């Protein structure tokens, strides 16, 4: 690991746009990762820092980086309702059908939290509506179990 | 009264003897401690929930307890931390003056009624309610130097063989073990468990059945069959007592008839209850006892009694076991006492030298030598009656009073001598005439000084409790001093002084004294000539006086304030903070490097490093630690460079280089509770169920804005911990139900294995101890280990954890805080240089007003009092000023004359500020109390000048200038005598280095500076004050 | 209930007594643990 890498992981998480800016100019490792395998892009996607997500991607971040449990930044963005980040990630080649170690996809996570607009975006980019997690569940199964009728309609 | 006792010297001696016996008795029985109680009473509720994360603790323990803290009297505020070590502490702080025992019992009683609402495992651990205190009398470390004992072994030895006898030792009020007694540790192995289709649930069940106390009854119990010959108790199953017995616990009998024992699925050993702290002393495994002084105990006797108890345990120590004393306040306190006693004695010898120098006969010299000790002794008696202790504060109160006591003795004796020489009157009649000149003034002075000192006893909170120590000590001494001046010294002058022929001023003596006398009479004429010229030209002196007043205000406003000076207490701390998520092993490597630095680079100064891995002040965990450094005795650390501040500075500089860690050293505060005079303690509060993340965002928003005002705010920072990655595991209920696996087996398998579980108690050599089950370390380290744990389904199949669970990383808080029952985040900071804390606080409030909807704030600790009892001073000195004026008006029977005395105030204050400013000191409590004593003494000088002049005008029809010149002529000698003796006597304090020199310098410098200017200026200015005031009115 | 004197003493009496330290004005403490499982600890304080 590198010192600039650590500083970038922290700045990305905290949403310090300007520090990120400077770190990018100085070549701070965009592919740095902490112990759980989170990159600056994972952090930015989780905490919802849109501008940093965009800067990171412009500076060669791996859009499809996965943590030690197989989760990608798209998983995080989708799960926590960050719509515009979701759209940017997808625009930049994020795998819409990425499965983590549990067979869980970004669609499962968005459905689980009832993020309707994010669900629609994912379907628009080719998300597999019939993907099953390790328990054989689909997004539709989640919607009915949660009793989310609007979401259930969409996934029909 | 003086006349009364002039004719009754024996009655005066009897009063003196009674005072001395009372004082002697008081000195024998007075408690002794470094500091009296000062912080408001606080009660802490502590609970543990093995394996619980911060949110689990908060939401099943902390909130429930907080919700029940009602109907308790005199609560100021309540605060809590719930943390991922599975620990909660709730602290309730009460109004000053609250009975701490009643506060604690009310708290404990509300808790008792909340216990049934807490989780079973928390009820099983127990919830402690204790009086909160931060001061230790001492810390006894116990180490093993031959490598035969772990810290767990040591802690158990200490608990079983040392702690109780220390607890029973005279004077000790409380003892904390740095570790635990042994627990029986069952370390489970998932592979063996699965091999035999068993789970931690089965282990727990077998232990509860096979390690238990079972009630039976009696043979021949009542009511019996008549004719019964025997009655005896039946003893059935009793608790296990050994690792061997635990290993033999039967878990299962196989079909082939072979047996599965606990030792076949687990390693069994005596071990610690907890493994969060690793303690080392110079690199060796360590335990220890933290000892507190009992209420009203004598610190010096208690320390000696502890050492005596330790000495007789020594013969029974296992090999390699050794006692060390990394912290003991007692040697320091001993030095303070010797230093104060030494100061008082030298002061008395100085008075003797000055009295003889000016008066040149041993009889006059005898009088203060008797009077002063009588006053000091009597003061102890009064302190005793007030329930005070001999402590740092009360002892320095006595030396700050020295000038006042010495002055009373000198004033009374010197005036009799003057009268005899000037009139030829015999000692008795001279003493009568003399006392007639000063007795009224002496009483007026007593009232004036009471008006100056008593108000300081009325400040609130912690600072008030400090001022109060000085105020009551000085007022008591001052009151006894005037009593003695009116009762004893006049008796002594009348009976011990010899006659002086009228006109004899010793000018015709030989050698040194004739010369001194002729010289001093000449100087007195120079002085009066000079005052005469001054009084022909008062205008320019009014201008000079204003210059002084302005310079005072200027100096005063630029002098930074503090509370109490740091000391080289022979120990200091170094903090070790690694990044969040760092492991115990990483922290240990940094501590080892820290310890290695001190024993190597500070080899000549450092006796020991006590390294505590896993302990922090504002949060615990594997990524935090402290290295407590003990130095060699001051005597072997000659030089400013081998004292704490210097070592500290060098240490922090050397560590500025440590890679991924924040490491630094610092001195201890004199009294921890006062924080910084300059610092503030702010609480951000979730007022609307916003939740942790939004509170965090608002906190960050606040911190960013603070950082844009470096001109007002510095080091504005959170006191707590940042969120960290945590491993979220979801149990799939449907799959569990489909497989026939109960949630209860799932959850105890997980918690018992990965978090540990307190099962029940056993008896280890006659002492009851805990039994814990938990996975062996290597099967609970990583996510992949989860799937190695199996649960048994209803149908007998073993199902891996991975079959019914899923997991993901997320962030969460390792430490959740609450304030008055609501989620909160504490923020510390200080006023920027040259800025008041009030100003800094006002800005923080301004910034706080712009935060998101639903976010509030409050002030706590030192700031709570500020927002309160910091609104009192100028109200108290306004009262003081008014009472002083009124007393003076009564003394002089004039509404105007009192001004001529009050004008004296700045004269001493300017010199104190100059000296403090020049030595780079601060405006602290010692400086402040000294200002009062300096002002007190200059006021007294002026009161007597003015009294004499006025009397000359009233009684002998003398002109204004004539009377003023004669009065100032008469007061010159006694004023000089007192100033000389006091200035010399306080000089050692000024240049003092070494132990306690911080406090000594603080009281000495201000006093010496103030006395210089008060003396030099007053003898020229008070005649000006008197003349201009009289002319004006 | 049901415990012998020594069991009661080891599990109850000593546990309580080892916490009866640093109480104000305590003159002496006495206790007994008996075969009925009963414990009584009496603390006697300075007059006044
Ligand atoms: C030889 C005798 C010596 C004389 C000794 C006498 C000292 C007595 C001490 C008086 C008590 C001081 O503390 C007490 O504090 C409060 C405020 O906090 C004061 O109250 C004052 O402060 C507040 C705030 O500025 C004002 O709103 C209020 O109108 C004002 O009167 C009390 O008037 C005062 O009495
Ligand atoms: C231990 C304590 C003291 C140690 C030593 C102290 C010495 C310090 C010197 C300060 C004394 C003041 O000095 C005094 O000033 C006045 C003027 O204001 C002089 O008086 C003379 O000058 C003024 C004006 O120029 C005239 O109005 C006046 O009529 C004249 O006689 C005095 O002759 C002088 O003695
Ligand atoms: C004949 C009457 C004579 C009256 C003379 C009185 C003045 C001498 C007393 C010494 C104190 C000097 O300074 C005064 O005291 C306080 C002590 O808390 C100092 O220190 C502090 O005071 C208050 C009290 O908590 C704080 O809120 C404040 O932040 C701080 O400055 C202040 O700087 C000043 O208010
Ligand atoms: C074993 C003996 C008991 C030990 C008592 C424990 C005291 C508790 C202090 C915990 C404080 C946490 O860390 C903190 O240490 C200090 C408070 O003392 C501060 O240190 C402050 O106090 C000092 C001692 O008078 C100074 O010389 C520093 O200039 C001042 O900054 C540090 O800026 C801060 O980082
Ligand atoms: C805090 N302190 C001065 C020390 C110093 C050296 C030590 O060796 C230790 C401590 C704290 C004590 C607290 C005790 C406490 N109890 C008194 C047993 C306690 O509640 C815990 C705990 N984690 O719950 C310990 O870590 C603890 O068992 C422990 O292992 C300690 C310990 O090992
Ligand atoms: C132990 C206290 C000392 C007692 C002092 C006794 C001295 C008494 C002398 C009294 C004679 C006074 C002149 C008549
Ligand atoms: C005859 C003159 C009497 C002088 C009395 C002095 C004491 C008065 C002090 C009053 C303080 C209230
Ligand atoms: C606070 C007191 C100020 C009062 C001063 C008035 C003096 C009046 C004296 C009149 C002299 C005859
Ligand atoms: C008149 C002064 C008498 C002092 C009384 C001392 C009481 C001490 C109680 C042990
Ligand atoms: C100020 C006088 C206090 C002296 C008492 C010291 C007690 C010594 C016992 C160790
Ligand atoms: C607070 C008391 C003030 C009294 C002043 C009286 C002045 C009298 C002037 C004639
Ligand atoms: C004249 C009063 C005598 C003093 C008694 C203490
Ligand atoms: C004669 C009055 C005595 C007052 C003592 C302070």
Q: What is the CATH number of the domain that holds B318?
A: 3.30.70.1320
Rg (CA), chain A: 16
Residues B385 and B446 in one domain: yes
Contact (CB, 8 A) for B20 and B376: no
> Could you tell me the distance, in angstroms and rounded to a whole number, from the CA of residue B10 to the centre of ligand 6?
7
Q: Tell me B231's DSSP state.
A: -
The angle formed by the CA atoms of residues B763, B766 and B770, to the nearest 5 degrees, is 30
Residues B70 and B9 in one domain: no
B398 in Cβ contact with B340 (< 8 Å): yes
Chain B contact for C1 (CB, 8 A cutoff):
yes
Judged by a CB distance cut-off of 8 A, whether residue B526 touches chain A is no
Residues B368 and B465 reside in one and the same domain = yes
Element (H, E) at B184: strand B183-188
What does the block give as tokens for B675?
């924080």
Sheet holding B266-271, edge to edge: B266-271, B183-188, B767-775, B757-764
- Euclidean distance between CA atoms B958 and B970, whole angstroms: 15
Contact B146, B162 (CB under 8 A): no
**3-state SS, residue B729:** strand
Say yes or no: B635 and B573 in one domain.
yes
Report whether B852 contacts B858 (CB < 8 A): no
Tokens found for residue B394: 């009360």
**Domain of residue A144, residue span:** 1-156
Cα(B425) to ligand 6 centroid in Å equals 25
Element (H, E) at B269: strand B266-271
Q: Strands B183-188 and B606-613: what pairing?
A: unpaired
**Residue B854 and residue B935 in one domain:** no
Q: Cβ distance B150 to B285 under 8 Å?
A: yes
* Best residue among B446, B838, B871, B872 to mutate for probing ligand 1, ranked by most atoms within 8 Å of CB: B872
Give A3's Cβ-side CA count (13 Å radius): 5
The DSSP secondary-structure symbol of A114 reads T
Cβ B251 vs Cβ B264: under 8 Å? yes
Given a contact cutoff of 8 angstroms between Cβ atoms, the answer to whether B902 and B885 are in contact is: yes
Structure tokens at B10: 């024996």
CATH of the domain at B409: 1.20.1640.10
CA B884 / ligand 11 centre spacing (Å): 13
Which is nearest to B354 in space by CA: B447, B346, B1002?
Answer: B346
Q: Which burial class, exposed, middle or buried, applies to B635 when counting CB atoms under 10 A from its CB (0-12, 13-18, 19+)?
A: exposed
Does ligand 12 come within 6 angstroms of the Cβ of B14? no
Tell which of B232, B257, B275 closes a domain: B275
Segment 238-257 of chain B within 8 Å of chain C by CB: 238-239
Q: Kindly give the pairing relationship between strand B172-177 and strand B42-48.
A: unpaired
Pocket, ligand 6, Cβ cutoff 6 A: B 9, 13, 17, 20, 495
In this structure, which residue's CA is closest to atom 18 in ligand 5?
A: B180
Q: What is the DSSP letter of B260?
A: E
**Using CA positions, which residue lies closest to atom 2 of ligand 7?**
B440
Judged on CB neighbours under 10 Å (0-12, 13-18, 19+), B888 is: buried
Residues B563, B999: Cα–Cα separation, whole Å: 11
Q: Which atom of ligand 11 is nearest to the CA of B886?
A: 2
**Residue ranges of B 708-727 with Cβ closer than 8 A to chain A:** 725
Contact C10 B767 (CB under 8 A): yes
Half-sphere exposure of residue A97: CA atoms within 13 angstroms, side-chain side: 9
Q: Could you tell me the CATH number of the domain that includes residue B706?
A: 3.30.70.1440
Cβ-contact B639, B826 below 8 angstroms = no
Angle at B782 between CA B781 and CA B784, to 5 degrees: 135
Query: Which two tokens mark B400?
Result: 């700050």
Nearest to B459 by CA among B872, B74, B925: B872
Contacts of B874 (CB under 8 A, 6+ apart): none
Q: Are B61 and B119 in contact (CB under 8 A)?
A: yes
Query: Which tokens is B193 given?
Result: 């468990």
DSSP A26: T
- Interface probe for B, chosen from A1, A36, A99 (most Cβ of B below 10 Å), is A36
Q: How was this one solved? A: X-ray
Asked if residue B573 has its Cβ within 6 Å of ligand 5, the reply is no
Question: Which of A38, A68, A135 is opposite residue B783, by nearest beta carbon?
Answer: A68
Q: Which two tokens stand for residue B671?
A: 């009294």
Residue with structure tokens 């009268």?
Answer: B419
| Alpha carbons B411 and B978: distance in angstroms, whole number | 8
Please give the C-alpha separations between residue A107 and each of A91, A110, A147, B703, in angstroms, as whole numbers: 16, 5, 17, 37
Contact between chains at B167 and C24 (C-beta distance less than 8 A): no
Whether residue B786 has a cis bond before it, omega within 30° of 0: no
CA angle B610, B612, B614 (to 5 degrees): 175
> From the CA of B658, how many Å to the nearest CA of chain A?
13
Pick from B833, B848, B868: which residue ends a domain?
B868
User: Which residues of chain B come before a gap where C and the next N are over 2.5 Å apart?
Assistant: none
Residues B261 and B401 in one domain: no
- Measured over the CA atoms of residue B196, residue B198, residue B203 and residue B208, the dihedral's sign is negative
Structure tokens at B645: 């501040």
- Alpha carbon of B343 to those of B349, B795, B926, B964, B982: distances in Å? 10, 87, 16, 36, 11
What's the total number of domains in chain B? Answer: 8
Q: Where are the beta strands (DSSP E) in A15-135?
A: none
Ligand 10 near B331 CB (within 6 A): no
Which SS3 state, helix, strand or coil, does residue B840 take? helix
Rounded CA-CA distance B92/B73 in Å is: 11
Q: Measured in Å, how far apart are chain A's first and last C-alpha atoms?
A: 47
* Contact assignment for C2 to B238 by CB distance below 8 Å: no
> Quick check: helix, strand or coil at residue B130?
strand
Query: Residue B378: exposed, middle, or buried by beta-carbon count in 10 A (0-12, 13-18, 19+)?
Result: buried
Instruction: Please give the sequence-ordered ranges of beta strands (E in DSSP) within B749-862, or none if there are none.
Output: 757-764, 767-775, 790-792, 798-800, 805-812, 815-819, 822-831, 855-859
- Asked if B231 has any chain C CB less than 8 Å from its own CB, the reply is no
Determine contact: A144 vs chain B, CB below 8 A.
no
B77 φ/ψ angles, rounded to the nearest 5 degrees: -170, 165
Q: What CATH number is associated with residue B771? A: 3.30.2090.10
B551 burial via Cβ count (<10 Å: 0-12, 13-18, 19+): middle
Quick count: other Cβ atoms within 10 Å of Cβ C46? Answer: 8
Q: Torsion angle of alpha carbons B247, B250, B251, B252, nearest 10°? A: 140
Q: Name the residue range of residue B840's domain.
A: 674-723+821-868
d(CA B242, CA B542): 90
> Which chain B residue lies closest to A46 (C-alpha atoms)?
B810
Question: Which residues on adjacent β-strands are paired with residue B729?
Answer: B807
CATH number at residue B116: 3.30.70.1430
Q: Is B881 in the pocket of ligand 3 (CB under 6 A)?
A: yes
CATH code, A151: 1.25.40.20
Sign of CA dihedral A107, A110, A116, A118: negative
Partners of residue A102 in chain B, C-beta under 8 Å: 806-808
Q: Tokens at residue B125, please?
A: 């651990």
Element (H, E) at B812: strand B805-812
Q: Of B293, B328, B363, which residue is a domain's last?
A: B328
Touching subunits of A (3+ CB pairs, under 8 Å) are: B
Residue B754 φ then ψ, to 5° = -90, -30
CA dist B602 and B64 (Å) reads 50
- Record the tokens describing residue A91, joined without a space: 């625009």
**Are B928 and B1009 members of one domain?**
yes
Considering its fold, how many domains does chain A have in total?
1
**Main-chain phi, psi angles of B203, to 5 degrees:** -60, -50
The candidate with the shortest Cα–Cα distance to B828, out of B856, B863, B855, B854, is: B863
* Alpha helices (H) in B360-426, listed in sequence order: 362-386, 392-400, 402-423
Distance from CA of B617 to the nearest CA of C (A): 26
Q: Annotate B912-954 with three-state secondary structure.
A: HHHHHHHCCCCECHHHHHHHHHHHHHHHHHHHHHHHHHHHHHH
Q: How far apart are CA A51 and CA A44, in angstroms?
A: 9
How far is C3 from B234, CA to CA, in rounded Å? 10
Closest CA to A66 of A29, A91, A30, A41: A41
Cα separation of B511 and B515, whole Å? 7
**B795 and A CB contact within 8 Å:** no
Judge: B768–C10 Cβ closer than 8 Å, yes or no.
yes
Q: Where are the beta strands (DSSP E) in B272-361?
A: 278-281, 284-293, 321-328
Task: Tell me, yes or no, if B715 comes closer than 8 A to chain C by beta carbon.
Answer: no
B-chain residue closest to A133, CA distance: B806
């Amino acid at each position: 690991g590198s010192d600039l890498g650590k500083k970038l992981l922290e700045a990305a998480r905290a949403g310090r746009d300007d520090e990120v800016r400077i770190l990018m100019a100085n070549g701070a490792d965009v592919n740095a990762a902490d112990v759980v395998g989170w990159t600056p892009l994972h952090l930015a996607a989780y905490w919802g820092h849109l501008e940093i997500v965009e800067v990171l991607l412009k500076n060669g971040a791996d859009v499809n980086a996965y943590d030690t449990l197989g989760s990608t930044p798209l998983h995080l963005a989708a799960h926590f309702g960050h719509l515009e980040i979701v759209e940017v990630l997808l625009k930049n080649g994020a795998d819409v059908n990425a499965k983590d170690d549990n067979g869980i996809t970004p669609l499962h996570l968005a459905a689980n939290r009832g993020h309707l607009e994010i669900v629609e975006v994912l379907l628009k980019y080719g998300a597999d509506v019939n993907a099953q997690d390790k328990f054989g569940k689909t997004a539709f199964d989640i919607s009915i179990n949660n009793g989310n009728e609007d979401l259930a309609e969409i996934l029909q | 009264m003086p006349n009364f006792f002039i004719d009754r010297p024996i009655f005066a001696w009897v009063i003196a003897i009674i005072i001395m016996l009372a004082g002697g008795l008081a000195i024998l029985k007075l408690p002794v401690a470094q500091y009296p109680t000062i912080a408001p009473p606080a009660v802490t509720i502590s609970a543990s929930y093995p394996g619980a994360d911060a949110k689990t603790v908060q939401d099943t323990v902390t909130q429930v307890i907080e919700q029940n803290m009602n109907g308790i009297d005199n609560l100021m505020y309540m605060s809590s931390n719930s943390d991922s070590t599975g620990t909660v502490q709730i602290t309730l702080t009460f109004e000053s003056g609250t009975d701490a025992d009643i506060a604690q019992v009310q708290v404990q009683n509300k808790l008792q009624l909340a216990m049934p609402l807490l989780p079973q495992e928390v009820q099983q651990q127990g919830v402690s309610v204790e009086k909160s205190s931060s001061s230790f009398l001492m810390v006894v470390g116990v180490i093993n130097t031959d490598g035969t004992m772990t810290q767990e072994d040591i802690s158990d030895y200490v608990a079983a063989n040392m702690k109780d006898a220390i607890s029973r030792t005279s004077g000790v009020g409380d003892v904390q073990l740095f570790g635990s007694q042994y627990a029986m540790r069952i370390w489970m192995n998932p592979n063996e468990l699965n091999k035999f289709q068993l789970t931690p649930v089965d282990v727990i069940t077998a232990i509860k059945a096979q390690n238990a106390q079972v009630a039976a009854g009696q043979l021949g119990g009542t009511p019996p069959v008549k004719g019964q010959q025997l009655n005896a108790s039946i003893i059935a199953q009793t608790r296990l007592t050994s690792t061997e017995e635990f290993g033999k616990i039967l878990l299962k009998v196989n079909q082939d008839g072979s047996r599965v024992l606990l030792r076949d699925v687990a390693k069994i050993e005596l071990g610690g209850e907890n493994y969060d702290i690793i303690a080392e002393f110079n690199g060796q495994p360590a335990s220890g006892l933290g000892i507190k002084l009992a209420t009203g105990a004598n610190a010096l006797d208690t320390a000696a009694a502890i050492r005596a108890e330790l000495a007789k345990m020594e013969p029974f120590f296992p090999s390699g076991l050794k006692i060390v004393y990394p912290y003991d306040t007692t040697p320091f306190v001993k030095i303070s006492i010797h230093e104060v006693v030494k100061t008082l004695v030298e002061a008395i010898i100085l008075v003797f030298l000055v009295m003889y120098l000016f008066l040149q006969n041993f009889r006059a010299t005898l009088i203060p030598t008797i009077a002063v000790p009588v006053v000091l002794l009597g003061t102890f008696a009064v302190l005793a009656a007030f329930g005070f202790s001999i402590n740092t504060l009360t002892m320095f109160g006595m030396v700050l009073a020295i000038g006042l006591l010495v002055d009373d003795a000198i004033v009374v004796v010197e005036n009799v001598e003057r009268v005899m020489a000037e009139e030829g009157l015999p000692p008795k009649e001279a003493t009568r005439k003399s006392m007639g000149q000063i007795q009224g003034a002496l009483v007026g002075i007593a009232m004036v000084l009471s008006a100056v000192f008593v108000p300081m006893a009325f400040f609130g909170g912690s600072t008030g409790a400090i001022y109060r120590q000085f105020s009551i000590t000085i007022v008591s001494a001052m009151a006894l001093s005037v009593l003695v001046a009116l009762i004893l010294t006049p008796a002594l002058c009348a009976t011990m002084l010899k006659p002086i022929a009228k006109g004899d001023h010793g000018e015709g003596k030989k050698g040194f004294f004739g010369w001194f006398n002729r010289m001093f009479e000449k100087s007195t004429h120079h002085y009066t000539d000079s005052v005469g010229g001054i009084l022909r030209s008062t205008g320019r002196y009014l201008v000079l006086y204003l210059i002084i007043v302005v310079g005072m205000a200027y100096l005063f406003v630029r002098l930074p304030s503090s509370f109490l000076p740091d000391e080289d207490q022979g120990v200091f701390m170094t903090m070790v903070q690694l990044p969040a998520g760092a492991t115990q092993e990483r922290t240990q490597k940094v501590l080892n490097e820290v310890t290695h630095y001190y024993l190597t680079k500070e080899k000549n100064n450092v006796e020991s490093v006590f390294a505590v891995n896993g302990f922090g002040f504002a949060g615990r965990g594997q990524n935090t630690g402290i290295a407590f450094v003990s130095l060699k005795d001051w005597a072997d650390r000659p030089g400013e460079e081998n004292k704490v501040e210097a070592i500290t500075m060098r240490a922090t500089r050397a560590f500025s280089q440590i890679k991924d860690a924040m490491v630094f050293a610092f001195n201890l505060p004199a009294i921890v509770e006062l924080g910084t005079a300059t610092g503030f303690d702010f609480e951000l509060i979730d007022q609307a169920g916003l939740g942790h993340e939004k509170l965090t965002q608002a906190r960050n928003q606040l911190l960013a804005e603070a950082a844009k005002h470096p001109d007002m705010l510095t080091s504005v920072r959170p006191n707590g911990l940042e969120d960290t990655p945590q491993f979220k595991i979801d149990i799939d209920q449907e799959k569990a139900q489909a497989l026939g696996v109960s949630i209860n087996d799932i959850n105890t398998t997980l918690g018992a294995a990965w978090g540990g579980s307190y099962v029940n108690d056993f008896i280890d050599r006659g002492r009851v101890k805990k039994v814990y089950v938990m996975s062996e370390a290597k099967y609970r380290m990583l996510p992949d280990d989860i799937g190695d744990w199996y649960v048994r389904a209803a149908d007998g199949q073993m199902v891996p954890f991975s079959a019914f669970s899923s997991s993901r990383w997320e962030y969460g808080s390792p430490r959740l805080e609450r304030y008055n029952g609501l989620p909160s985040m504490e923020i510390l900071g200080q006023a920027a240089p040259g800025k008041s804390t009030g100003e800094a606080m006002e800005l923080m409030e301004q910034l706080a007003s712009k935060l998101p909807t639903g976010v509030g704030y409050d002030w706590t600790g030192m700031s709570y009092q500020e927002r309160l009892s910091g609104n009192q001073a100028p109200s108290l000195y306004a009262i003081s000023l008014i009472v002083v004026f009124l007393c003076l008006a009564a003394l002089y029977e004039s509404w105007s004359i009192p001004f001529s005395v009050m004008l004296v105030v700045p004269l001493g204050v300017i010199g104190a500020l100059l000296a403090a400013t020049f030595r780079g000191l601060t405006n602290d409590v010692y400086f402040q109390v000294g200002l009062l004593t300096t002002i007190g003494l200059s006021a007294k000088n002026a009161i007597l000048i003015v009294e004499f002049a006025k009397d000359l005008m009233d009684k002998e029809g003398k002109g204004l200038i004539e009377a003023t010149l004669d009065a100032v002529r008469m007061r010159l000698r006694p004023i000089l005598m007192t100033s000389l003796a006091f200035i010399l006597g306080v000089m050692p304090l000024v240049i003092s280095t070494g132990a306690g020199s911080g406090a000594q310098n603080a009281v000495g410098t201000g006093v010496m500076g103030g006395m210089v200017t008060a003396t030099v200026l007053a003898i020229f200015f008070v005649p000006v004050f008197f003349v201009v005031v009289r002319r004006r009115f």
